[PDB]
Amino acid sequence: GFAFKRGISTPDLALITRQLATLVQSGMPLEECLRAVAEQSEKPRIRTMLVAVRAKVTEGYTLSDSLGDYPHVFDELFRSMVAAGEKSGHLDSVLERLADYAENRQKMRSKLQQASENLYF
Ligand SMILES: [Ca+2]
User: Fold this and answer.
1) 86 a known binding residue?
2) 2 C-alpha vs ligand 1 centroid, how far in Å?
3) Which CATH number fits domain 1-121: 3.40.50.300, 3.90.1300.10, 3.90.1010.10, 1.20.81.30?
4) Which of 8, 51, 55, 82 could form a disulfide with 64 if both were Cys (CB 3.0 to 4.6 A apart)?
């Protein structure tokens, strides 16, 4: 019947996107980068997802295709950016952009959430 899953927190996405961008830009293979981000995670759910994303990458699927198994986590814009890097041979640069993006999203969202709580109480 019906299913419903939620995404991850804005700081959680900011962390894994920064970590992945750091690793890929350093020249490490994508599969190894995904393993490092998973094994460095404090969050079981994020660990499990990245193992699953990695598993598809090792079966030959693109990163963008693989992230599409978690559309509740990585929205269409995020996955399009990934696809454009992969298509063009600029996966490193796009991940850097997405990491800056995810960090700016976390800051603005957290500021707004905090402002709501401060004022309400
Ligand atoms: Ca940057």
Assistant:
1) no
2) 40
3) 1.20.81.30
4) 82
